Amino acid sequence: KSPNRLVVDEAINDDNSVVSLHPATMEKLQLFRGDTILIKGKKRKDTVCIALADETCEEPKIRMNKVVRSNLRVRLGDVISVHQCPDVKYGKRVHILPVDDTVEGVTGNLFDAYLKPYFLEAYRPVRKGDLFLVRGGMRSVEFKVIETDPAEYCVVAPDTEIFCEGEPVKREDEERLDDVGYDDVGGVRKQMAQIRELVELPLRHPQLFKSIGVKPPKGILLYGPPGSGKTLIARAVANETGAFFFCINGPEIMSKLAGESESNLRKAFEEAEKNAPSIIFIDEIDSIAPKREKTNGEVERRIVSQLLTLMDGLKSRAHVIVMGATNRPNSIDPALRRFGRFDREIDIGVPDEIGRLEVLRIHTKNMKLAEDVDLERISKDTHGYVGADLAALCTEAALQCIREKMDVDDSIDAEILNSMAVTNEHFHTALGNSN
Amino acid sequence: DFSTAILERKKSPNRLVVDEAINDDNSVVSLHPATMEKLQLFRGDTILIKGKKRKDTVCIALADETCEEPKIRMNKVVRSNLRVRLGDVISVHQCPDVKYGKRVHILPVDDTVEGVTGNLFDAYLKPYFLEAYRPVRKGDLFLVRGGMRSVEFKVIETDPAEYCVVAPDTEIFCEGEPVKREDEERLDDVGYDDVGGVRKQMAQIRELVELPLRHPQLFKSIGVKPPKGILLYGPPGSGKTLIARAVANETGAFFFCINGPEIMSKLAGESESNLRKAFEEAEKNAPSIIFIDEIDSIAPKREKTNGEVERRIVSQLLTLMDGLKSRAHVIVMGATNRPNSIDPALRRFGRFDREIDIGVPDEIGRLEVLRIHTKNMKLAEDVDLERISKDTHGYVGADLAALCTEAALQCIREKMDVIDSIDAEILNSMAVTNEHFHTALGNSNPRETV
Amino acid sequence: KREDEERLDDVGYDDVGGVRKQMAQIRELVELPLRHPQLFKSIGVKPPKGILLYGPPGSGKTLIARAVANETGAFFFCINGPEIMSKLAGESESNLRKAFEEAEKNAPSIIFIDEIDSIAPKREKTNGEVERRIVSQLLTLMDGLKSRAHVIVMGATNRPNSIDPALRRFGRFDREIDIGVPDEIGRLEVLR
């Protein structure tokens, strides 16, 4: 099968049209830099991308963003086959329409706001049926390639007509491109790699441990202050693995009646086993299962014990990974840290200057920023900030930009939103109104 | 415009509606002779059909005067191999490059071969392809019947590549560990072809459910609110649960099953919490079908309610039905063998508006049911399913289904002595005789007045 | 002292008289699922689960059940109508579940529900709220039981017409055996 069969790895550069390969691999497959290649994925889907040389890319691997991955019906770690296509001719005309659930509330023409600066002197390969994401104007719009001339695939050149007449397309059997991924979690590089190593094998290759006599981890405890991205990391891991995501919420369980909280707790574990490979995320795990001395309620002790037995009763053959999250690790019941329950513990602290800059880049993706904007300087100033603190600073600087730039019905055009830039003055005003 | 001309010309005689097959063959699709004349296709010709999720298959096209001009008759296997359902639109295309197979690699699906032993080729694939010249496409899944069960197989590879016709000179490779099921439902799942003796009742249910469940966005433009609740009536074992599962599978609707005793077995308050959560899940995963089995266990008449918390559950069901909107895309199906014991408040407009009576099957209807539960069975020439239907007067669907399973066991005991454990090639060879059906009739436990 | 061998005085088919035809019927239904349980894994045929034994008190319904279990080597769990109904509210259903759970764990098994009319009587004869909760618990336990579990449930009652009709449904108590009063020949067998 080798060498055309390669392993799917993360992209350094987020471009919907570019895939990165090792220069020795491209030499073996006789592909030059800038050449358009045809990649074949799962569910009989395929796409066309620009192949680029990368020394940091592993020889048997391929670097590609979430858009390329979704268009190939693959996930990180899966295998695709790269093929060369000489039929790649420039586009005469392409029919592109948006996805209705990504244009809710959006007004004006989407060509001048999104598609025009997207394809401009980029010479993007385009294949019929593909879906791509364009960022700008405080949001991101998903677009489907309805038709291409010449048929099946073409390169969108400056002489290519981009036809956009028609009602937005409805979503079909393919997940949102705006869904949480590893590219949306910043400042936790080491912690993310640790979690990924523990979960990727049991969730991506569950049948593998049927042959091996090794039982993998079940429970993971995420530690860290509120808004440090514990919920985010869990959703990111579940989306990136294709694992079924069930979310248990500490207060949600504890708000229910006596007996109803237990019934909900067992039904949550039951559903995860049924839809496995799964990830059970217990948010605010200290609401349920706190220390024996701290809580004195009779039915409360019954819930802590219910959680422990549900963890014990869970088998490695069930293919369910339970993720607990708390900002109070020392308030949590020590019986949960037992072997067979929450064996491993990951501490997601406060992000450093570098980590904060990463987080700031994430929540400015769909935002037009001025040259006067220094995200490096903001990260230098925002010392005690967590992921949510930095995310809130961006949203505040965004709505400060909306008020300051726009005056005078309430539905604002996409072309106008995409043009307004957030300044250093908007970020300074947001910093002053934040603690 | 260019792309506008493409989309508006999607009214070509090459675009047809998916209808049911009269003859159950995984390789044959039926079309109207005037449609094949328009599409320049001859009887016996192999055609390429393209469906949904960029999936396609190759079938033998056959002329049928009973087939509608804008429709196409295809079985559940062909339907699934195209990622389509009855009522959907596919496009038929000319297939002139179908060369005979050099070699095909075929493997079964694990969940269909649980407990099965011996060579699957001599038992299933060999009589399946024999002088049939079956078109075969890579990635396809098909069903083979015999030996008291049905095995699902996957087409792993074809030579020549992608598609070929399995001829007598084609090598069939079927060795290795069974494949694991991935993103595809079981071909043995209950469908309209598994429900017999209720032709008129099935057509009625289908008309009421197919539009709201297959085209839910259609009633957003139209100001017409469709039915929500349907009451199925009929004696125990008349296929009420079956019809519900068949309708849900055939529509792709999410199937949530509420069971009368299951709800009533729970504590006070737990039964209503479960009842709410059932309706909530259906709305979340809609288009959905809520099936309330033994609806008379929950919601009986106010006279028959001899409990305080019991009347609280009847009222909970009524408000859940009232609280359900057309915009939710959920159809509630209730089933009872005691229509007169059910609370009359359920029959109100906005709750259970329509009622379908699934009675006892007649001679014709019983023969249909007998054909269904002998699908995976080898029958002798001495067997006369027409004569069994003539005798089994007053038998419901379950009574006839039990008669087949008993005649099947009577055949296992009578023909097989000491094996231990049976393998597929021996199970596929043993035939159920008229003597086995006579013995099953002698030990059976099965009325209609004006 | 006894070691790894059952009592030779244990009840067997040779201890049940006057029910020749009924015994042969029960034996045909139970022997294949209980003696060859792995056989129905290859065959796509699902065998019977529930059997209702009918007959006056002291006609050997409990005896037939113990005889069948001993002769097959099946694990015998005995549920007693009054024993379940003597327990508190909630304790009766917990016991009822645990009985079905133990039988599945130690399968091939035979659950024998004696005086099945004490539990699960007709909906008219149920003059209690928690009583109707037990009838419903039994029906769902029968429905929740799979063929793959290798458990056969045997119910016994002297009042077949007082029993809830929902038990006779396909998937619960599919087959019914009437063990009447023995005739001259049958009585001589019992006397021997």
Added chain:
Amino acid sequence: IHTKNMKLAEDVDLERISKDTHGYVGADLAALCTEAALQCIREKMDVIDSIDAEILNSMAVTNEHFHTALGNSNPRETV
């Protein structure tokens, strides 16, 4: 009342329907209109996908659609 937003054919006789629908209440008659409306949607419109306003406003419910709705309906006064 329940044909207000519906295009009706000249072949439609609401006077004759009222003559036949003896023992029908308000809801029974309202359901007969909605059923005749759906019977018209299925019979007139083939494959669209989703219908637009100018085409919906043009399709007329016929006496045949009301006859078909009457045939599948589920509807007494003594001294």
